[PDB]
Amino acid sequence: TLSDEKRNHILTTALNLFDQFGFQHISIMRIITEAKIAKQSFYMAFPSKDSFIIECLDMEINRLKQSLSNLLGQCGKDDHTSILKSFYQWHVDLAYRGYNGTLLTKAVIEYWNLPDIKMKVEDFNKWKYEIFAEYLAEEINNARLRIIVSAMNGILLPASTYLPTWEDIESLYGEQFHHHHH
Amino acid sequence: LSDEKRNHILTTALNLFDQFGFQHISIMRIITEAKIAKQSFYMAFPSKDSFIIECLDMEINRLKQSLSNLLGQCGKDDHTSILKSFYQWHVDLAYREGYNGTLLTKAVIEYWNLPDIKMKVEDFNKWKYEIFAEYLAEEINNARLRIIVSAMNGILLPASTYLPTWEDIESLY
């Protein structure tokens, strides 16, 4: 049977393939040849190509959740500026890291025919708003939260331009009237 | 090739692409759906890549005329209406059943190997910021302009949630 190191290696090899060529271009046999595994090892682990791709999407989502969770958790308690700057930089870094769009966006585009994929990606975007709101919903009203999170999601649109800067976002934050009544 | 048949072929393809994506839909399918002869189509569009670039150019031109005409409808002084229209245009693009991204986003993602497509979509996106700014530059500062336009592009990201509402945007102005 198959070690878990090798199973996870097939998943992470494919993810690297998909990130740079997209899902359509890449077959099972291409994945098998890139990952240097026996064809029979793939099918011991994965019953179908679409089952595999759902497993890849789920590991990409977990990795983004863990990256962002950790970044926001490194900030000091109630250092809301540092949390907001971390959230901004996390999006800029994801967008600047051969980027033609995120892997999750590619999956939603490519798999209109598998409605669980769009729901998984919606669930992650809902999670990403909410962890931000958890750190900041007492310092930032709902309207500004919605604007800021959607402005960060616009940074992830491929070929996005005229990007908001950190200084732009810090102004949105600091202008808030409750910041000026003490 | 009739100019009329030209609009018919390119718009038949765009609607299939909008429904099923670029690589899913073949020339043969477009050619049968459009009811045009193989040999004529290849005289007008020698490759798929050639056809895709013409489709993308038309969609970009249509979007520019769609937004330009919508904004051109507001009164010269009417900054709220300009801003509401820019918001509504983005919602109107993305708030349809089965939405999984705009055609421009799909083209940039599907054709990473054709740098001409990313650059035409980028140029459209600079155009969109700049026409909005030209309306509102004396009224809203650069920081709020960049944030609002980025927020509207986030409405266009597929599977996006917790979208800003008109009243959110109106509160920011």
TrEMBL record, chain A:
GO terms for molecular function: DNA binding. Keywords: DNA-binding, Transcription, Transcription regulation. InterPro entries: Homeodomain-like_sf, HTH_TetR. It comes from the Bacteria. Residues 27-46 bind DNA. Residues 4-64 form the HTH tetR-type domain. SUPFAM superfamilies: Homeodomain-like. This is TetR family transcriptional regulator.
